């Protein structure tokens with residue numbers, strides 16, 4: 001009832017307020033209006049009973065639930081408007097402590113999903129966004145139009161530095177553009193970061209000299225802050241242009257710090273989203289992957305995985321790619337789960353596609369997700385009957401057929417490596 | 429079927445392997461053994477089809493599901509043993525990328541909850557643990573035996589530095605030991621960190637000089653890394669002994685970095701767990717708060733909130749307090765959801781109790797949770813009919829009755845401030 005003060009369905013936020021859309025399942029006995037005012041109060045200025053010193057900014061900073069949509073299943077969409085003065089400039093941690101913070105554990109709530117957040121220009125521009133973006137990564141690699149290709153070794157762990165370096169050579173030499181560490185590679189004793197990086201950067205130099213094509217390494221710098229700082233400088237000192245960071249397990253502050261060092265050292269960042277599915281799977285509680293991707297783009301990844309691609313989940317993968325690549329995102333008519341979002345001064349991000357992609361499947365992914373993607377094509381490459389070099393060539397020929405508008409069956413007659421890819425795995 | 433290679437119910441891990449216990453709900457059509465081998469493979473060395481360079485460490489690094497317990501509801505407990513060479517020394521991010529990483533989003537899994545992880549001594553000792561612990565915080569405050577008391581201002585936001593400083597004075601002057609920022613206080617423009625800290629540290633100096641009692645400020649340094657570093661030094665330069673960090677919204681690497689600066693500057697750390705309920709609420713998917721508390725103690729908080737306290741949730745709050753305070757945690761007989769854990773070389777943590785605590789309720793919380801706690805007693809203090817000074821005195825008298833073994837009704841006859849606390853709120 002003190003919480004009615006935070007609800008106002010006659011309010012109209014301007015374009016200059018932060019807007020959150022929540023999917024709210026009130027606990028038993030709690031009305032949606034009650035739950036919504038508690039969410040608005042807890043994620044902004046709290047409450048007071050008696051005032052022993054005036055807070056001159058309380059009514060100014062207060063958030064308002066101004067709009068309700070009954071989903072007919074026990075949950076509601078609630079829009080909450082937030083004054084921008086609630087948030088510290090350029091700080092993802094402070095944003096998350098408000099809108100992604102205690103509200104998830106309140107007793108009045110049986111489920112709370114944060115679906116999307118609209119950031120106004122004055123707040124959005126306090127964040128750097130990607131250092132390089134799609135166009136800067138294409139320029140690093142010299143790849144004008146086609147999708148870029150990446151491969152993680154198999155197995156993901158178990159190689160000494162010497163062994164890992166020979167594995168990378170075969171991958172790059174046949175046409176893959178980026179060799180990628182897996183998410184749990186860091187600097188374990190069996191393969192320390194520096195000794196591993198030397199062996200891969202020697203493999204890159206050979207492959208560039210023989211192919212004529214630039215190559216890069218998505219080196220995993222996930223680490224406590226001081227160790228990450230050293231590893232980012234070692235990557236830079238070896239002439240590599242990319243770092244990878246597990247931004248949910250190292251954390252948002254680590255990602256924003258890596259983004260500052262990327263500025264200093266002229267690097268691109270691959271953001272790995274490991275841990276996201278602990279809280280992005282349940283449609284009734286947690287954070288949508290859509291919003292995690294939007295925050296990753298603000299914080300400054302240049303690449304981010306959007307999940308796997310007609311049905312509801314494919315529709316949402318398509319919304320993920322739109323929110324990370326577009327300069328002006330607009331929800332389709334009647335879609336209440338996302339908000340309109342201009343991205344003035346924030347470069348687009350490369351969506352990463354992955355999930356058992358073989359040469360046969362690549363044209364359809366490119367037609368559906370567009371050419372501005374990174375495809376991770378591990379199984380298709382390392383599992384080719386003629387070895388990984390031929391495997392990377394098959395993927396490149398498959399991509400070539402898609403760029404040239406040629407049927408795969410037709411292309412796979414003057415192209416040996418691809419021919420056996422279609423033989424072995426077909427159109428999966 | 430390649431995944432049978434990671435299951436072995438005849439295996440007996442030594443005391444020197446990391447052990448995880450997962451609650452696994454296989455997807456439709458997937459057997460538990462299949463799901464369990466996929467979890468073990470994905471959280472360790474992955475798989476391979478053909479080998480183009482030998483991984484000399486694959487079979488050595490491989491994790492094994494060695495034990496199954498059917499919960500009779502569609503989910504199983506699965507124990508997985510992990511060689512310690514999988515993990516980078518002292519790195520919570522690398523640990524999380526393995527055991528808290530991609531396994532949550534695998535298609536074979538309909539739910540995956542990480543219930544607990546046993547850390548062997550050789551791995552556990554690569555982490556610093558608390559800088560101060562219970563005993564070091566008691567020595568900072570000069571509080572030998574009783575619970576320590578903390579208060580967050582109301583409202584949690586809206587005060588200028590000048591206004592916030594007068595609010596803190598009244599809190600400390602009447603007997604509260606620690607004034608605490610709320611989780612979303614950082615350095616917003618209406619109340620910047622430095623100007624706020626000056627006003628509170630002047631309030632502390634007055635209160636210590638008038639009461640004779642040491643006081644402290646849990647200053648929220650949650651921020652991008654460079655801003656946090658400056659704020660931790662400003663806290664230290666002003667002679668304050670505490671920092672607070674939202675360790676899930678700033679992230680694990682930020683917490684471990686704050687722990688190194690606390691070493692340098694001789695500070696204690698209050699860890700705020702905002703965001704945890706996005707993934708610790710669902711018993712079928714996510715991470716138990718028990719394990720989050722264990723990782724917080726390893727990473728080095730000195731205080732951590734354990735959630736609110738006979739039934740199942742109270743039992744678990746009691747297990748939370750045991751895992752953060754004990755030197756040798758042992759599950760009760762037949763409890764399969766937790767593992768035995770020695771804490772050699774890791775100081776105990778102060779559990780924090782909170783949740784509408786009034787003077788009437790305090791003795792029961794102290795009898796149930798023990799004297800080695802921090803109680804957050806905001807409403808009881810700021811809402812006292814005679815003002816917050818009297819409110820802090822009522823809480824202290826209530827604590828005094830509990831230490832002295834005196835009934836509250838009896839104590840509240842020669843103690844005015846408390847008398848009205850029992851009048852107003854009673855025994856809630």
Ligand SMILES: [Ca+2]
Nearest residue numbers: 272273305352
């Ligand atoms: Ca990825």
Ligand SMILES: [Ca+2]
Nearest residue numbers: 700701733780
């Ligand atoms: Ca707390």
